[PDB]
Amino acid sequence: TGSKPFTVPILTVEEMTNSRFPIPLEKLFTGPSGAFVVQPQNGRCTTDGVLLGTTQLSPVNICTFRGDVTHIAGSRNYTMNLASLNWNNYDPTEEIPAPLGTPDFVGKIQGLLTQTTKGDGSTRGHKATVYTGSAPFTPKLGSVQFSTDTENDFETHQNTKFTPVGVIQDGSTTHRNEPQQWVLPSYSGRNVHNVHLAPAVAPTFPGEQLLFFRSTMPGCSGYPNMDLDCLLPQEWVQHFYQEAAPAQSDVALLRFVNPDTGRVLFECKLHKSGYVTVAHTGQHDLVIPPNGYFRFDSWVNQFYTLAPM
Amino acid sequence: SKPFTVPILTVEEMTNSRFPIPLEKLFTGPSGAFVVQPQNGRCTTDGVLLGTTQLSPVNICTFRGDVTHIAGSRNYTMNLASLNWNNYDPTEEIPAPLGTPDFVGKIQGLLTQTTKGDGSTRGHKATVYTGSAPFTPKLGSVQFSTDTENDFETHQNTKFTPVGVIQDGSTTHRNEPQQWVLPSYSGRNVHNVHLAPAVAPTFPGEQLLFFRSTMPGCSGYPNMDLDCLLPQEWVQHFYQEAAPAQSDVALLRFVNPDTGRVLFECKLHKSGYVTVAHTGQHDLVIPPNGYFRFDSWVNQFYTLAPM
Ligand SMILES: CC(=O)N[C@@H]1[C@@H](O[C@@H]2O[C@H](CO)[C@H](O)[C@H](O)[C@H]2O[C@@H]2O[C@@H](C)[C@@H](O)[C@@H](O)[C@@H]2O)[C@H](O[C@@H]2O[C@@H](C)[C@@H](O)[C@@H](O)[C@@H]2O)[C@@H](CO)O[C@H]1O
Ligand SMILES: CC(=O)N[C@@H]1[C@@H](O[C@@H]2O[C@H](CO)[C@H](O)[C@H](O)[C@H]2O[C@@H]2O[C@@H](C)[C@@H](O)[C@@H](O)[C@@H]2O)[C@H](O[C@@H]2O[C@@H](C)[C@@H](O)[C@@H](O)[C@@H]2O)[C@@H](CO)O[C@H]1O
């Protein structure tokens, strides 16, 4: 009695943003997930607005890094000592897995590393790639490495930003073998256990699968696997964070409605810990009308049987 | 009537509606001497998108299409597609494709491409000069300068992801970008159409309140300041809520949770911009947890407490 009514945004899928990389959502996808552990750290939020993992609120502070850089002699690599979003000191003892927004998959993320010299406002920018499966990827410790197209242009002790664009793959190896979107980086480096993680999720009900919000990351070199699935759109993270409507049960029943025809396409379970399941067996790209949207209908529980998708 | 609200997200939790970067601060200054007519980040309080405004925080200053190499150069012409990768339609009554840059500047980022057949991919640093003669997005074409003469393929999906801005370092520092100069969306001899209107304070002692970011600089000595009239999250919020405006102005109070006190009040005009009572340039100093709260509908001629 007296709970703030729960709701989800009325934005359509194509009007929303992937919570794991700064690109629009394209489609909904469902498939079996017994062959991987689904434990992304971005795009994690409970329905009552508790951010989990490395999740933060900005759609354009995801897979970014800020700090200052040191050149590694004999190479085009730079070590970035990480700062916070507002350029303050990074605190490695905060009870999070890594700075909020840190990439949550193993892959080679390419973008631009940019810098401004405080004294005169001179600026510079270079193509750069961060290898999140590599030994120098230690964001939790406050340090990551970038491979760039320069050995001398970046200055020390000047604010430097990495803006992600897409992913690459080693073209001499099996096509689409990376990125591995369901493999978490080791945030503190090789053989150091991750901490404070958002939990892995899986369907529990017979005949159910996770429902993913899917985008295609830009590819920047080689033959990458560009598929990227998030559990919640970034706008849903922002919505629940603000609304903070109490979860009246374990499961919010949503209906996906077509306002063009006035008919419900399918129903799904939004679990209070922040993920969606549907009743379907097999890999399936959902086909949805551009104006279709999710609408909260009622609180049910994990024993509720969904109508087949 | 449906109660009007603004998001409770703090400034640094929100996104610039004119370039895909976080908001950093609030800024006010006089703007009588020139025209404030941005086309992105334009939305009425009852949720009507204006100008070139669309809903995505990460489909702003992006481009998509097919590219063709200009022989004897490292420049490529992009024939624009839509977000769904369909043919572009120049007869829509908009100034240019939604999300088109709304300032004159040299925007640098990466041009990326996927070959459909084998999934091979490529990516190159590229710059679009929105003040250049070939910048004709309303006509379905813009030009990029890149670092290759041969790597991009024809008739393959190509995307530009913006990162920051550059300036010609052999010229007066910070002389470009010019954030308050609109591109000529159809080229230099064709006037712009279907624009969201220019905005100005009219009430004595008031100035615009800007939501400000610093665009990354990628070369030279650029002016990196970028002011939007509404955070992108406010655009998304009004679009969904569609709460009718009960008067010309929504009075907002900016509240500090650490004290429980109002820091300042401002006017959110129903056509989608904010004013404060202040004379002079000022970077507002705000607590990280400060937020805007709608307090009441007032008329346009309400007198604000001084900022
Ligand atoms: C121009 C081209 O196709 N070159 C092939 C080469 O791929 C290029 O390799 C260099 C390093 O030597 C850079 O990594 C380039 O980014 C890369 O080219 C990109 O990727 C290829 C697949 C094309 O889509 C191209 O248009 C694009 O610019 C390739 O090298 C292998 O693959 C690359 C990605 C890299 O992992 C190399 O270490 C690896 O040996 C070789 C052999 O596959 O073939 C060249 O023709
Ligand atoms: C290495 C350096 O500082 N060079 C200055 C030069 O700037 C470089 O010019 C080339 C073009 O010839 C490229 O545009 C480079 O990106 C540019 O270097 C960038 O910008 C400078 C200001 C530094 O921050 C540097 O670290 C960064 O990589 C510069 O040339 C003027 O400005 C550039 C942006 C370009 O517009 C030139 O056409 C223009 O003459 C000159 C004069 O300011 O000074 C050199 O020292």
mmCIF file of C-alpha atoms in Angstrom, chain B residues 37-147:
data_model
loop_
_atom_site.group_PDB
_atom_site.id
_atom_site.type_symbol
_atom_site.label_atom_id
_atom_site.label_comp_id
_atom_site.label_asym_id
_atom_site.label_seq_id
_atom_site.Cartn_x
_atom_site.Cartn_y
_atom_site.Cartn_z
ATOM 1 C CA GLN B 37 19.808 30.151 -32.621
ATOM 2 C CA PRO B 38 21.090 26.634 -31.985
ATOM 3 C CA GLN B 39 19.128 23.885 -33.764
ATOM 4 C CA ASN B 40 20.020 20.933 -31.553
ATOM 5 C CA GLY B 41 18.751 20.867 -28.010
ATOM 6 C CA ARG B 42 15.541 22.632 -28.994
ATOM 7 C CA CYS B 43 12.307 21.351 -27.499
ATOM 8 C CA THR B 44 9.195 22.947 -25.984
ATOM 9 C CA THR B 45 8.326 22.109 -22.379
ATOM 10 C CA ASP B 46 5.280 20.173 -23.673
ATOM 11 C CA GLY B 47 7.602 17.954 -25.738
ATOM 12 C CA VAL B 48 7.629 19.304 -29.289
ATOM 13 C CA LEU B 49 11.088 18.834 -30.850
ATOM 14 C CA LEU B 50 12.293 21.817 -32.848
ATOM 15 C CA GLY B 51 14.943 22.570 -35.454
ATOM 16 C CA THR B 52 17.218 19.592 -36.016
ATOM 17 C CA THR B 53 16.589 18.121 -32.583
ATOM 18 C CA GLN B 54 16.249 14.383 -32.165
ATOM 19 C CA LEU B 55 16.166 12.164 -29.088
ATOM 20 C CA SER B 56 19.506 10.342 -29.039
ATOM 21 C CA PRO B 57 22.404 11.692 -26.981
ATOM 22 C CA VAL B 58 24.748 9.738 -29.261
ATOM 23 C CA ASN B 59 23.289 10.570 -32.677
ATOM 24 C CA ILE B 60 24.382 14.216 -32.547
ATOM 25 C CA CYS B 61 27.049 15.385 -35.008
ATOM 26 C CA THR B 62 27.216 11.865 -36.423
ATOM 27 C CA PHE B 63 26.810 11.040 -40.095
ATOM 28 C CA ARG B 64 26.032 7.834 -41.974
ATOM 29 C CA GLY B 65 26.114 6.940 -45.642
ATOM 30 C CA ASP B 66 28.263 5.831 -48.575
ATOM 31 C CA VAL B 67 31.558 7.456 -49.443
ATOM 32 C CA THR B 68 33.309 8.279 -52.684
ATOM 33 C CA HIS B 69 36.957 9.268 -52.975
ATOM 34 C CA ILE B 70 37.847 12.616 -54.483
ATOM 35 C CA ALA B 71 40.696 11.806 -56.852
ATOM 36 C CA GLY B 72 44.050 13.400 -56.069
ATOM 37 C CA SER B 73 43.150 14.010 -52.432
ATOM 38 C CA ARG B 74 42.457 12.311 -49.102
ATOM 39 C CA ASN B 75 38.947 13.750 -49.144
ATOM 40 C CA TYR B 76 35.755 11.751 -49.388
ATOM 41 C CA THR B 77 32.245 12.833 -50.211
ATOM 42 C CA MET B 78 29.606 11.161 -48.083
ATOM 43 C CA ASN B 79 26.241 10.669 -49.657
ATOM 44 C CA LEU B 80 24.028 10.740 -46.589
ATOM 45 C CA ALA B 81 21.753 7.931 -45.476
ATOM 46 C CA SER B 82 19.273 7.929 -42.595
ATOM 47 C CA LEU B 83 19.865 6.384 -39.115
ATOM 48 C CA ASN B 84 18.229 3.178 -40.352
ATOM 49 C CA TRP B 85 20.685 3.231 -43.262
ATOM 50 C CA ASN B 86 17.916 4.043 -45.759
ATOM 51 C CA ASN B 87 17.989 6.608 -48.555
ATOM 52 C CA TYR B 88 17.972 10.245 -47.406
ATOM 53 C CA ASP B 89 14.864 12.413 -47.983
ATOM 54 C CA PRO B 90 15.663 16.120 -48.545
ATOM 55 C CA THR B 91 12.012 17.237 -48.835
ATOM 56 C CA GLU B 92 11.205 16.942 -45.108
ATOM 57 C CA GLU B 93 10.400 20.332 -43.583
ATOM 58 C CA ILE B 94 13.487 20.431 -41.379
ATOM 59 C CA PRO B 95 16.643 22.555 -41.756
ATOM 60 C CA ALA B 96 18.836 19.499 -42.250
ATOM 61 C CA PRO B 97 18.907 15.891 -41.078
ATOM 62 C CA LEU B 98 18.134 15.617 -37.362
ATOM 63 C CA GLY B 99 21.353 15.742 -35.362
ATOM 64 C CA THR B 100 23.301 17.685 -38.032
ATOM 65 C CA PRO B 101 25.899 19.982 -36.426
ATOM 66 C CA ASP B 102 24.437 23.391 -35.634
ATOM 67 C CA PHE B 103 27.688 25.336 -35.511
ATOM 68 C CA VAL B 104 30.480 26.337 -37.838
ATOM 69 C CA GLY B 105 33.546 24.361 -36.899
ATOM 70 C CA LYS B 106 36.016 21.703 -37.907
ATOM 71 C CA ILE B 107 34.748 18.547 -36.226
ATOM 72 C CA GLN B 108 37.222 15.702 -35.956
ATOM 73 C CA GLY B 109 36.433 12.075 -35.220
ATOM 74 C CA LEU B 110 36.688 8.664 -36.870
ATOM 75 C CA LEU B 111 35.173 7.529 -40.109
ATOM 76 C CA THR B 112 34.492 3.784 -39.864
ATOM 77 C CA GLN B 113 33.206 1.245 -42.337
ATOM 78 C CA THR B 114 32.116 -2.385 -42.559
ATOM 79 C CA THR B 115 32.213 -4.485 -45.734
ATOM 80 C CA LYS B 116 28.921 -6.451 -45.826
ATOM 81 C CA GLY B 117 30.352 -9.486 -47.589
ATOM 82 C CA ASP B 118 33.046 -10.585 -45.129
ATOM 83 C CA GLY B 119 32.586 -8.266 -42.151
ATOM 84 C CA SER B 120 35.975 -6.653 -42.722
ATOM 85 C CA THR B 121 36.245 -3.210 -41.122
ATOM 86 C CA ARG B 122 38.344 -0.043 -41.210
ATOM 87 C CA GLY B 123 38.638 3.254 -39.393
ATOM 88 C CA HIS B 124 40.398 6.516 -40.147
ATOM 89 C CA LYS B 125 40.744 9.896 -38.522
ATOM 90 C CA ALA B 126 38.521 12.378 -40.362
ATOM 91 C CA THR B 127 37.343 15.963 -40.142
ATOM 92 C CA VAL B 128 34.254 17.691 -41.472
ATOM 93 C CA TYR B 129 34.338 21.473 -41.834
ATOM 94 C CA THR B 130 30.783 22.614 -41.375
ATOM 95 C CA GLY B 131 31.558 26.079 -42.761
ATOM 96 C CA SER B 132 33.000 24.673 -46.020
ATOM 97 C CA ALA B 133 31.396 24.973 -49.448
ATOM 98 C CA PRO B 134 30.806 21.198 -49.744
ATOM 99 C CA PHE B 135 28.962 21.086 -46.392
ATOM 100 C CA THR B 136 25.478 20.605 -47.810
ATOM 101 C CA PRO B 137 23.740 18.127 -45.471
ATOM 102 C CA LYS B 138 20.260 19.399 -46.427
ATOM 103 C CA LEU B 139 21.121 18.462 -50.035
ATOM 104 C CA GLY B 140 22.330 15.044 -48.836
ATOM 105 C CA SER B 141 26.092 15.488 -49.100
ATOM 106 C CA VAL B 142 29.046 16.483 -46.906
ATOM 107 C CA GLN B 143 32.810 16.151 -47.361
ATOM 108 C CA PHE B 144 35.419 14.643 -45.011
ATOM 109 C CA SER B 145 39.175 15.112 -45.000
ATOM 110 C CA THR B 146 40.850 11.882 -43.907
ATOM 111 C CA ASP B 147 44.243 10.186 -43.611
#
